Design a protein around this ligand. Structure first.
Ligand SMILES: Cc1cc2nc3c(=O)[nH]c(=O)nc-3n(C[C@H](O)[C@H](O)[C@H](O)COP(=O)(O)O)c2cc1C
Ligand SMILES: Cc1cc2nc3c(=O)[nH]c(=O)nc-3n(C[C@H](O)[C@H](O)[C@H](O)COP(=O)(O)O)c2cc1C
Ligand SMILES: O=c1cc(O)c2ccccc2o1
Ligand SMILES: O=c1cc(O)c2ccccc2o1
Lengths: 217, 217
């Protein structure tokens, strides 16, 4: 099988973890750097990836399922790490300056061209919603990073469970300081599936027929 | 360098294509199958990938830049193929029926279980607009597929240019029948960069400091 297809046909959504296997620091570092290298509109990187690693952090995450989507709760303490994909509520010219400044430092643009580079920010200004927030534009960038992450995990042979069945309001309360100026609509548990109780590991993958999703013109 | 990091450090946004090189059908088939295998919330697959391959289709795509984002227009005819990432405006039970029916046909589930599988559709009603549109939920799923595609292209060593600088309104007119019931906010040109005029090929990649985007708890 072609290596790319093999990876995408073999990755799946784990439904039960093995609490005695942890992701190595070597593998976790690759995943985190892969997330950092994700592409985004105008190199905005309007995101923050929060890694729930410690027992104390896991308890806090565990508690965010207090009143909603409890079918996802058992994974928190059983898996190795949980990653929160946070997207910025509003993206300002100041946030953008952080990017442009770094670009001047990395030698991709000149300080003179920097001011000239601020014109690409108009693209952000046009995507400003009712309340003056850009969350409808920043959230999709974070999902792009998530797609990158899922492909990355398939290559490292690490199991995962993407989760939209979370409580964003309660997460913003529990991780108050960390999610300041951001929102979190999706989290990702990673680890190693349970050898006998992860029933999804044995089910066939199902997707729509090629002609139902692809059109060639 | 670690294979995953090498791929992500070496892929970049091409700013000029070589019109004499096309993507092979073998490579195109891998990319399209990779898009099809993308994960999505509840396996909804609320997307359609439209491939602009023929000269006639390229002309239509070329014409969608008549009003705006002219800086992106030259790539259309120069590159090999353009892929439109379309997301569904509203996701219904009939839409989910198609997913569940294919799941049954894929032996993933049984007809009896197909009836109980619709209980997962409750999560789609949770993203219904005041207008009844789920575009704020479907668009992020399409961006996840895009993140998957960008990683896939890095593995195949094919150049690309993601494009949000497009005209969704003009696209809806030009690709009237193909996009009925969908919207398209991002397209992707693929091909091979111009050997000497693609200036971005020689510029360093720039991303925010690890500490600025990643928090470990
Ligand atoms: C954005 C997103 C959110 C999802 N949320 C959940 C979730 O809350 N719980 C879980 O069990 N699975 C969740 N999934 C898993 C999907 O059901 C799964 O990706 C889809 O059925 C395709 O199956 P595979 O992932 O097994 O290929 C989610 C997936 C995506 C991409
Ligand atoms: C969603 C999205 C839309 C983008 N739109 C454009 C576009 O219209 N034109 C183009 O030249 N670059 C576009 N880019 C490219 C980004 O500027 C580029 O990904 C970011 O600067 C990081 O650089 P790299 O992609 O070279 O790593 C887009 C990227 C993303 C992910
Ligand atoms: O030069 C660019 C680069 C971008 O990332 C971009 C994004 C959205 C709109 C237009 C754009 O123009
Ligand atoms: O069983 C599932 C599968 C999903 O993909 C999902 C998505 C969002 C909310 C809850 C969910 O529960």
């Amino acid at each position: 099988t072609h290596p790319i297809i093999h990876d995408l046909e073999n990755r799946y959504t784990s439904k039960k973890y093995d609490p005695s296997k942890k992701v190595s620091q070597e593998d976790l570092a690759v995943l985190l750097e892969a997330l950092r290298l994700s592409a985004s509109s105008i190199n905005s990187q309007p995101w923050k990836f929060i890694v729930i690693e410690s027992d104390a952090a896991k308890q806090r995450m565990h508690d965010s399922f207090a009143n909603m989507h409890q079918f996802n709760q058992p994974h928190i303490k059983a898996c190795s790490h949980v990653i929160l994909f946070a997207n910025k509520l509003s993206y300002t010219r100041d946030d953008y300056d952080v990017v442009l400044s770094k670009a001047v430092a990395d030698k991709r643009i000149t300080e003179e061209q920097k001011e000239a580079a601020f014109a690409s920010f108009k693209f952000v200004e046009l995507n400003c919603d009712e309340n003056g927030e850009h969350k409808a534009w920043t959230k999709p960038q974070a999902y792009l990073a998530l797609g990158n992450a899922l492909h990355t995990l398939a290559r490292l042979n690490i199991d995962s469970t993407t989760m939209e069945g979370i409580d964003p309001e309660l997460l913003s309360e529990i991780f108050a300081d960390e999610l300041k100026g951001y929102e979190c609509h999706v989290a990702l548990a990673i680890g190693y599936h349970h050898p006998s109780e992860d029933y999804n590991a044995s089910l066939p993958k199902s997707r729509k027929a090629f002609e139902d999703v692809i059109t060639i013109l």
